Every structure is written in structure tokens, then in C-alpha cells.
């Protein structure tokens, strides 16, 4: 499982991962503060130099409930 970024069901989604949590987009946080503004990936190595968008990565299972939509639950 990983951490996803959509409340479609839960936070942690996409099993068969056993690797890392990757979610990225671009919007800093002034375009869609009521959606997501982030994308969903299940491990893909997150480089911090080449892209200019925002890319959060965390090796674990579910990471933290940072990318929320309505609250912090």
C-alpha cells in the first residue's frame, strides 16, 4: 500500500507496493485548496532537482495525512 492523495476511499491505497509513496503535481497551493493539487504514484523515485513541480516522496507504507482535502482527519 502507499499514501495516495485522494479521499476516494482511504489515504493508503495501491497495494503490491512495498516500496515508497510518490505523489506530485505543480500547484503550490493557491489554485485548488479544495481538491488535491497533487497526483498519485506508487513508488517511482522522487528526484529533487530536475522537476520544478512539487513532489513528495516517503519510503514506508502510508506516510502521513498531510495531503488532505477538507480537514486533517
mmCIF file of C-alpha atoms in Angstrom:
data_model
loop_
_atom_site.group_PDB
_atom_site.id
_atom_site.type_symbol
_atom_site.label_atom_id
_atom_site.label_comp_id
_atom_site.label_asym_id
_atom_site.label_seq_id
_atom_site.Cartn_x
_atom_site.Cartn_y
_atom_site.Cartn_z
ATOM 1 C CA UNK A 1 0.000 0.000 0.000
ATOM 2 C CA UNK A 2 1.174 3.616 -0.227
ATOM 3 C CA UNK A 3 -0.477 7.010 0.840
ATOM 4 C CA UNK A 4 -2.359 8.083 -2.278
ATOM 5 C CA UNK A 5 -3.716 11.640 -2.271
ATOM 6 C CA UNK A 6 -7.439 11.194 -2.938
ATOM 7 C CA UNK A 7 -10.155 10.583 -0.271
ATOM 8 C CA UNK A 8 -11.948 8.314 -2.822
ATOM 9 C CA UNK A 9 -11.830 5.639 -0.120
ATOM 10 C CA UNK A 10 -8.910 5.948 2.286
ATOM 11 C CA UNK A 11 -5.458 7.501 2.477
ATOM 12 C CA UNK A 12 -3.388 4.400 1.884
ATOM 13 C CA UNK A 13 -4.165 2.810 -1.434
ATOM 14 C CA UNK A 14 -2.421 0.913 -4.222
ATOM 15 C CA UNK A 15 -1.120 -2.304 -2.554
ATOM 16 C CA UNK A 16 1.611 -4.568 -4.017
ATOM 17 C CA UNK A 17 3.876 -1.542 -3.424
ATOM 18 C CA UNK A 18 6.287 -2.479 -0.581
ATOM 19 C CA UNK A 19 8.460 0.342 -1.966
ATOM 20 C CA UNK A 20 7.707 4.087 -1.377
ATOM 21 C CA UNK A 21 4.977 6.822 -1.578
ATOM 22 C CA UNK A 22 5.158 9.179 -4.577
ATOM 23 C CA UNK A 23 2.652 11.979 -5.241
ATOM 24 C CA UNK A 24 3.352 15.177 -7.316
ATOM 25 C CA UNK A 25 1.787 17.931 -9.379
ATOM 26 C CA UNK A 26 2.823 21.552 -9.606
ATOM 27 C CA UNK A 27 0.309 23.790 -7.759
ATOM 28 C CA UNK A 28 1.884 25.333 -4.705
ATOM 29 C CA UNK A 29 -1.471 25.658 -3.010
ATOM 30 C CA UNK A 30 -3.375 28.632 -4.391
ATOM 31 C CA UNK A 31 -5.209 27.047 -7.359
ATOM 32 C CA UNK A 32 -7.229 24.210 -5.825
ATOM 33 C CA UNK A 33 -7.024 24.328 -1.988
ATOM 34 C CA UNK A 34 -10.329 22.347 -2.004
ATOM 35 C CA UNK A 35 -9.232 19.412 -4.213
ATOM 36 C CA UNK A 36 -5.797 17.946 -4.127
ATOM 37 C CA UNK A 37 -3.422 19.864 -6.312
ATOM 38 C CA UNK A 38 -1.363 16.633 -6.191
ATOM 39 C CA UNK A 39 -1.207 13.373 -8.272
ATOM 40 C CA UNK A 40 -0.776 9.774 -7.119
ATOM 41 C CA UNK A 41 2.113 7.387 -7.651
ATOM 42 C CA UNK A 42 3.189 4.077 -6.001
ATOM 43 C CA UNK A 43 6.881 4.318 -5.785
ATOM 44 C CA UNK A 44 8.800 5.836 -8.613
ATOM 45 C CA UNK A 45 11.872 7.542 -7.173
ATOM 46 C CA UNK A 46 11.291 11.278 -6.440
ATOM 47 C CA UNK A 47 14.221 13.461 -7.656
ATOM 48 C CA UNK A 48 14.581 16.935 -6.084
ATOM 49 C CA UNK A 49 16.454 18.969 -8.695
ATOM 50 C CA UNK A 50 15.201 18.167 -12.188
ATOM 51 C CA UNK A 51 11.426 18.759 -11.819
ATOM 52 C CA UNK A 52 10.069 22.174 -10.776
ATOM 53 C CA UNK A 53 6.704 20.976 -9.570
ATOM 54 C CA UNK A 54 6.035 19.756 -6.038
ATOM 55 C CA UNK A 55 6.901 16.103 -5.402
ATOM 56 C CA UNK A 56 6.517 14.461 -2.026
ATOM 57 C CA UNK A 57 8.048 11.021 -1.511
ATOM 58 C CA UNK A 58 8.234 8.883 1.633
ATOM 59 C CA UNK A 59 9.535 5.268 1.889
ATOM 60 C CA UNK A 60 7.204 3.436 4.313
ATOM 61 C CA UNK A 61 3.558 2.294 3.874
ATOM 62 C CA UNK A 62 1.151 5.200 4.337
ATOM 63 C CA UNK A 63 3.318 8.183 5.189
ATOM 64 C CA UNK A 64 1.398 10.942 6.979
ATOM 65 C CA UNK A 65 -2.101 12.501 6.494
ATOM 66 C CA UNK A 66 -0.613 15.706 5.078
ATOM 67 C CA UNK A 67 -2.364 15.906 1.663
ATOM 68 C CA UNK A 68 -5.914 16.314 2.881
ATOM 69 C CA UNK A 69 -8.917 17.979 1.191
ATOM 70 C CA UNK A 70 -11.388 19.167 3.815
ATOM 71 C CA UNK A 71 -9.626 18.743 7.142
ATOM 72 C CA UNK A 72 -6.676 16.683 8.593
ATOM 73 C CA UNK A 73 -8.502 13.518 9.551
#
